[PDB]
Amino acid sequence: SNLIEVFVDGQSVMVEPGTTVLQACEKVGMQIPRFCYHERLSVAGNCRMCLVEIEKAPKVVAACAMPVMKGWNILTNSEKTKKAREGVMEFLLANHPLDCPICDQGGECDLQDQSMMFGSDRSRFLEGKRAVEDKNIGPLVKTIMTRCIQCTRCIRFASEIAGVDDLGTTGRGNDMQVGTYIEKMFMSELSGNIIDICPVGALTSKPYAFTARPWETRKTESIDVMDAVG
Amino acid sequence: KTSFGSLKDEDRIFTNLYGRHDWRLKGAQSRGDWYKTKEILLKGPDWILGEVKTSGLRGRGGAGFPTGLKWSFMNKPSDGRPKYLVVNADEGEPGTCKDREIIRHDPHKLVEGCLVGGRAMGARAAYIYIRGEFYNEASNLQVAIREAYEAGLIGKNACGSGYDFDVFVVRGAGAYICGEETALIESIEGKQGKPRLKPPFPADVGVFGCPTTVANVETVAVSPTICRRGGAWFASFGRERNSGTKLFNISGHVNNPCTVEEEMSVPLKELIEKHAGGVTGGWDNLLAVIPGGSSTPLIPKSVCETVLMDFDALIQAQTGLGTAAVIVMDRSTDIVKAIARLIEFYKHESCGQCTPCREGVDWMNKVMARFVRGDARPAEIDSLWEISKQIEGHTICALGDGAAWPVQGLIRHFRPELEERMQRFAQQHQ
Amino acid sequence: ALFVHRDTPKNNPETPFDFTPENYKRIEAIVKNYPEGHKAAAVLPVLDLAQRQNGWLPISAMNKVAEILQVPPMRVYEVATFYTMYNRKPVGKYHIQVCTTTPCMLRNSDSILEAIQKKLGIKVGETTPDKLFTLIEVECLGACVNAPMVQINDNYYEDLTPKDIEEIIDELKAGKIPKPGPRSGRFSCEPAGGLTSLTEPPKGPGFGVQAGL
Amino acid sequence: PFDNTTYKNLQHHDYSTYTFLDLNLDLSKFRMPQPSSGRESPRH
Numbered sequence A: 001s002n003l004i005e006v007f008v009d010g011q012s013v014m015v016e017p018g019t020t021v022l023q024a025c026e027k028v029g030m031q032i033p034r035f036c037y038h039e040r041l042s043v044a045g046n047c048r049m050c051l052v053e054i055e056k057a058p059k060v061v062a063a064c065a066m067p068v069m070k071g072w073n074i075l076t077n078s079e080k081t082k083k084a085r086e087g088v089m090e091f092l093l094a095n096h097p098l099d100c101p102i103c104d105q106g107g108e109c110d111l112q113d114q115s116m117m118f119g120s121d122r123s124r125f126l127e128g129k130r131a132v133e134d135k136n137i138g139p140l141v142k143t144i145m146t147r148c149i150q151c152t153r154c155i156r157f158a159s160e161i162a163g164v165d166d167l168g169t170t171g172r173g174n175d176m177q178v179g180t181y182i183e184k185m186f187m188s189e190l191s192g193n194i195i196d197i198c199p200v201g202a203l204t205s206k207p208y209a210f211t212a213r214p215w216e217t218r219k220t221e222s223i224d225v226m227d228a229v230g
Numbered sequence B: 001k002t003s004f005g006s007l008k009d010e011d012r013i014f015t016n017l018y019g020r021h022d023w024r025l026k027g028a029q030s031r032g033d034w035y036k037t038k039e040i041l042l043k044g045p046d047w048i049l050g051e052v053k054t055s056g057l058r059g060r061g062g063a064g065f066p067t068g069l070k071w072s073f074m075n076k077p078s079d080g081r082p083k084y085l086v087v088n089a090d091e092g093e094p095g096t097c098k099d100r101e102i103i104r105h106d107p108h109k110l111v112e113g114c115l116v117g118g119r120a121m122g123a124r125a126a127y128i129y130i131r132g133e134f135y136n137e138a139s140n141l142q143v144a145i146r147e148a149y150e151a152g153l154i155g156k157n158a159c160g161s162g163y164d165f166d167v168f169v170v171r172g173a174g175a176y177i178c179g180e181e182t183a184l185i186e187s188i189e190g191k192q193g194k195p196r197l198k199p200p201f202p203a204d205v206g207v208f209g210c211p212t213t214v215a216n217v218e219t220v221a222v223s224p225t226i227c228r229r230g231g232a233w234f235a236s237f238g239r240e241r242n243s244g245t246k247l248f249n250i251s252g253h254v255n256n257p258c259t260v261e262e263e264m265s266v267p268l269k270e271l272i273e274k275h276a277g278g279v280t281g282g283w284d285n286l287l288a289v290i291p292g293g294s295s296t297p298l299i300p301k302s303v304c305e306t307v308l309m310d311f312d313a314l315i316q317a318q319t320g321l322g323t324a325a326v327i328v329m330d331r332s333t334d335i336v337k338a339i340a341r342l343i344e345f346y347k348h349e350s351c352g353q354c355t356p357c358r359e360g361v362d363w364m365n366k367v368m369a370r371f372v373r374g375d376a377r378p379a380e381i382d383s384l385w386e387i388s389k390q391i392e393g394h395t396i397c398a399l400g401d402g403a404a405w406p407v408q409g410l411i412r413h414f415r416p417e418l419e420e421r422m423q424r425f426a427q428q429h430q
Numbered sequence C: 001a002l003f004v005h006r007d008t009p010k011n012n013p014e015t016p017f018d019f020t021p022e023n024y025k026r027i028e029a030i031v032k033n034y035p036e037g038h039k040a041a042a043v044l045p046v047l048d049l050a051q052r053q054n055g056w057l058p059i060s061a062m063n064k065v066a067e068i069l070q071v072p073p074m075r076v077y078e079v080a081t082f083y084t085m086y087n088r089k090p091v092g093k094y095h096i097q098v099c100t101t102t103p104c105m106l107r108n109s110d111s112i113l114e115a116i117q118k119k120l121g122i123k124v125g126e127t128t129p130d131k132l133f134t135l136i137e138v139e140c141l142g143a144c145v146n147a148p149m150v151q152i153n154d155n156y157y158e159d160l161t162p163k164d165i166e167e168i169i170d171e172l173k174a175g176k177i178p179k180p181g182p183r184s185g186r187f188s189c190e191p192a193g194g195l196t197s198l199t200e201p202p203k204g205p206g207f208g209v210q211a212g213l
Numbered sequence D: 001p002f003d004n005t006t007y008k009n010l011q012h013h014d015y016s017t018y019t020f021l022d023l024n025l026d027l028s029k030f031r032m033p034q035p036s037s038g039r040e041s042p043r044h
């Protein structure tokens, strides 16, 4: 047997080689907070929300990009893990605009949910926030780039699954904007799925925009009939 | 040995550092370079790596990692992939110009070091990532590369040993973050200079996915001298696990800012009073010294008296060695303005890939601008310290830590000046 | 100051641009400098090559560089926008950069900057109306021991004084080319008060070698 | 003899815009054949 045993919160579990920390933590039925990791996209490791602490190791590792080894003990509820989560949440909410009432992601927002669950309760940022120029990328995806957090799921989706290679990250530093650098109309057969993978309200559905709110919607499962994929 | 320094001209690694002799092949070969290279290449990579490991040579980039172990990381059998050696000649750190002097005045020493290092780890070819702004330096380096190529020293059957070795020079595009080894690897491959995550290490996946080792100019150009003179010759200098000779770039409010070679564990006071020509206005005018460029915290006069300029004594003085870049500030300076400009420089050189640096460096810039103006509350100063603790250790690369360290040092050493400035502003404006 | 592009009559994909055949051979050599299967690694100098063709990069070298290397154009857009050397706006014939980093402001680079401003009669980032000089500020350029300094086109001018920089300006306006070197007593990096080290001549080959080598 | 009062890096004043590129063009004839990955691009 090539499988190795690792430890999470003092509990042993048996994982495969090449398995990251987050996959083992999901194997023991816990969810490490994340913004840029996706189970169907490549690992970017830039949001730094998934930082956890391995014991006897004075540096936090990214659980979405660190392979495990035999004998490792992972503390997912220690003090420094919560401190790192609060710091990353504060940095993410430092430049986020006060647009929650007028944003369609409200009620199903990842940023709000993990800010309540793992972030702090007040903002120490007393300066003026940034403002990003909006873009027009088609008649289906309403775009407001001021609310983006540079998670780069746009980029990986456009370069790996859709394979259109139109989206990119222009500029350097905090002024870097996720866009196409020109008035490029991003149209493809799988464009609207980016609205699924945006954790913030930067990309929204244009026909659905300013129409409803997720907490008052009943969900009924069904099958598509427009195409024969089912 | 206790007194360290006073290095003779017979032990200096880089002759013609000042450009007073010929830098071409006929001048370099007359100064001792390109001598008995064939026997060095023929003796064995294991012997070369052992000679480097016994010498105690450490990281000349500023990281402080031992060079022998890191070079021996790739001493493994291949899996069908080529192996690569890359020389980091970006040198975007403020206060640092030694690699510029090496690539402008001793290019053939760099080429021989590339050949020796590539033999040591079995590299197929060598890539030199020159800085974009160093156009004349890159042209001189390529002239020396062509002169070494036409002499049969490198290329097919390099130095008559049957071992092929190719060398390349690639120019940058004006980015300090490209100096980071993983961002340099990404920049060579044709993407933006955005660093990778370790693991996987460059020894496993580097440029083009090949096993690749990235080393500084100053730690590559000394390798043929390391093999020739011997490991114990380099181990004779400095303290234990602090061997070698270092190039120091002294600048700031100094009578004669200059680049000079010296021993590792020389006291800072002796070096700055001997080679630099002394602090302007005497010793009593000195206010602070940054010992490693923009990446290290500053130290005041109370710590600058009896500090040894090696890794252990500087890490004992809650700062770092850095790239041995001595930036000197006297009493006629606005120190908070200097740290604010350093933080603004860090803001203008940050790739923005990972969140804590991308937000906290801008936040630190705003806070330090308000501190230079003085428009804040005193407790916010302590709050700024906490912001540093939310950056140091939570980043992809070490630029965020390199921005958090000078702010921590400035606060820890000159909180009274900061608080008196802002309370003076509050009194005189409200 | 903008990281997005808008279609202007002076900057559009329909703007004519092409490479000379000698530049095509240079691009071929640059491509051959890299391993097969990694042609995109040639996208860094070749685009810079296009800058040396024009002095600035409109969106016609971007598409051409993307076309001649089989890469998507958005990669070239990312490379051009991420790096500060690639001018996407038409700069003057002599691009002047002044270092205002801490080891350069320590040696009063602000006086030199104000001298350039009162000589050329422009502001920070502004272009002279004869399309000759462009004055911006950048980070450390590697001449800290010879601070203060400027960089004009591809030439370094170190250890400058206000008289020195105004002489450089009024000699550049006359059509000649100045001397890219420090203007103080020292030549490259030695102390101005004589050689503190390397006064002895070098010892040549076969010195201090070990047995068995 | 021995000279120590002259700067020997006087060639760098005489460099044009295309000196690096034409130097690379001239030096390309001395280089080894590059290794192959099996495909002309990772997008293939």
Ligand SMILES: NC(=O)C1=CN([C@@H]2O[C@H](COP(=O)(O)OP(=O)(O)OC[C@H]3O[C@@H](n4cnc5c(N)ncnc54)[C@H](O)[C@@H]3O)[C@@H](O)[C@H]2O)C=CC1
Binding pocket: B059, B060, B061, B062, B063, B064, B065, B070, B091, B092, B093, B096, B179, B181, B201, B202, B214, B295, B296, B320, B322, B323, B398, B402
């Ligand atoms: N030389 C210059 O111009 C500048 C230097 N620096 C300095 O550079 C340093 C930051 O750069 P790094 O290379 O990231 O420093 P360091 O953390 O990474 O590591 C030094 C070397 O050891 C390797 N390494 C690190 N951890 C390893 C491990 N667990 N196993 C195997 N190999 C490992 C790295 O790949 C690297 O080659 C700082 O000390 C900073 O002060 C910063 C700015 C400019």
Ligand SMILES: Cc1cc2nc3c(=O)[nH]c(=O)nc-3n(C[C@H](O)[C@H](O)[C@H](O)COP(=O)(O)O)c2cc1C
Binding pocket: B058, B059, B060, B061, B062, B063, B064, B065, B066, B067, B088, B089, B090, B091, B092, B093, B176, B177, B178, B179, B180, B181, B214, B215, B216, B217, B219, B397, B398, B399
């Ligand atoms: C932001 C950043 C910039 C860096 N810039 C340089 C550089 O310009 N030159 C350099 O030699 N090392 C630079 N380094 C350090 C490298 O990561 C690495 O330590 C060095 O290239 C090789 O180290 P060595 O001396 O042990 O060979 C930088 C590191 C960081 C984090």
Ligand code: SF4
Binding pocket: A096, A097, A098, A099, A100, A103, A104, A105, A106, A107, A109, A110, A111, A112, A147, A199, A200, A201, A202
């Ligand atoms: S995306 Fe931003 S504005 Fe919208 S609900 Fe979330 S935090 Fe609020």
Ligand code: SF4
Binding pocket: A148, A149, A150, A151, A152, A153, A154, A155, A178, A197, A198, A199, A200, A202, A203
């Ligand atoms: S717009 Fe949304 S999905 Fe796209 S990079 Fe920003 S946060 Fe990620």
Ligand code: SF4
Binding pocket: B177, B194, B195, B349, B350, B351, B352, B353, B354, B355, B357, B358, B395, B396, B397, B398, B399, B400
């Ligand atoms: S710390 Fe800053 S410069 Fe380094 S990877 Fe993160 S965003 Fe880039």
Ligand code: FES
Binding pocket: A033, A034, A035, A036, A037, A044, A045, A046, A047, A048, A049, A050, A051, A062, A063, A064, A065
């Ligand atoms: S989920 Fe790991 S860094 Fe984003």
Ligand code: FES
Binding pocket: B093, B094, B095, B096, C099, C100, C101, C102, C103, C104, C139, C140, C141, C142, C143, C144, C147, C149
């Ligand atoms: S700080 Fe100006 S050249 Fe380095």
Ligand SMILES: [K+]
Binding pocket: A105, A194, A195, A196, A197, A198, A199, A200, A201, A202, A203, A204
């Ligand atoms: K969304």
